Design a protein around this ligand. Structure first.
Ligand SMILES: Cc1ccccc1-c1ccc(C(=O)O)s1
Length: 258
């Protein structure tokens, strides 16, 4: 079996810096936005429809101080993690539809063991499996180091499901959500700068929750003006309304097709 070859971007927590993390997220954004183009200075990710299988995925190869390596597969249509490989096993989130189920059969096709979880990659179920909300799961280089080891050792049963789910929540936010939002990239750069370890505040969590709604609102807008306002949160958890794309141009880096 000679598998389909997808673009690969490398990141290591070993000696990570603001620069190396910045280079990584910019490279991930680069390979996500080669298809489709810009609306209000914000790139729209390729549409699911008509996209050849050979262009459907990018791979993120993560290494850590323990010199363990896992490869995450990201769907170029939404920047989100669909599955990963560690050694001779690949693990996939439960696909949402028959089309996505067929598409992921093209990933890691030479791997000896394929596993598909009963749960999807959505935070609601991952938080239940982890035994914590995103607001109580620390992010930073330390959590990412640990998450890489946890994903690696699941291949041999060394990792318990709650720790695997916690580890997915860490990787998704520090990779997918950072690619999607300059604001969240900024949050992760700040943690790395100050060698910090801290849970995302409500501003980050509400942006993650609102990515789909913001993508639709911006693309359906009358030259930037929303048909309905969108409620986001400040760092202190208070709600404000957004009526227009302007304030979001520095915040949101990528949108899903509307
Ligand atoms: C989330 C968001 C979007 C657009 C513009 C601003 C903001 C804020 C994040 C945090 C904020 C505080 O703590 O005031 S305001």
């Amino acid at each position: 079996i000679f598998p389909k070859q997808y673009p690969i971007i490398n990141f290591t927590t070993a000696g990570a810096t603001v620069q190396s993390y910045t280079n990584f997220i910019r490279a991930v954004r680069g390979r996500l936005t080669t298809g489709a183009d810009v609306r209000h200075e914000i790139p729209v990710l390729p549409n699911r429809v008509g996209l050849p299988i050979n262009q459907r995925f990018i791979l993120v190869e993560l290494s850590n101080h323990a010199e363990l390596s896992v490869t995450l597969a990201l769907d170029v249509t939404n920047a989100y993690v669909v599955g990963y490989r560690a050694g001779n096993s690949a693990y996939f989130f439960h696909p949402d539809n028959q089309e996505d189920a067929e598409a992921i059969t093209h990933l890691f096709t030479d791997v000896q063991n394929r596993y598909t979880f009963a749960f999807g990659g959505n935070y609601d179920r991952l938080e239940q499996l982890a035994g914590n909300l995103r607001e109580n799961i620390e992010l930073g280089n330390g959590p990412l180091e640990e998450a890489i080891s946890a994903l690696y050792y699941y291949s041999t049963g060394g990792t318990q499901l709650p720790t695997l789910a916690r580890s997915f929540i860490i990787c998704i936010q520090m990779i997918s959500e950072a690619a999607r939002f300059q604001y969240i990239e900024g949050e992760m750069r700040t943690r790395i700068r100050y060698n910090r370890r801290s849970a995302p505040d409500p501003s980050v969590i509400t942006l993650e929750n609102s990515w789909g709604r913001l993508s639709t609102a911006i693309q359906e807008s009358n030259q930037g003006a929303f048909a309905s306002p969108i409620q986001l949160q400040r760092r202190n958890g208070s709600k404000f309304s957004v009526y227009d794309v302007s304030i979001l141009i520095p915040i949101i880096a990528l949108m899903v097709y509307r």
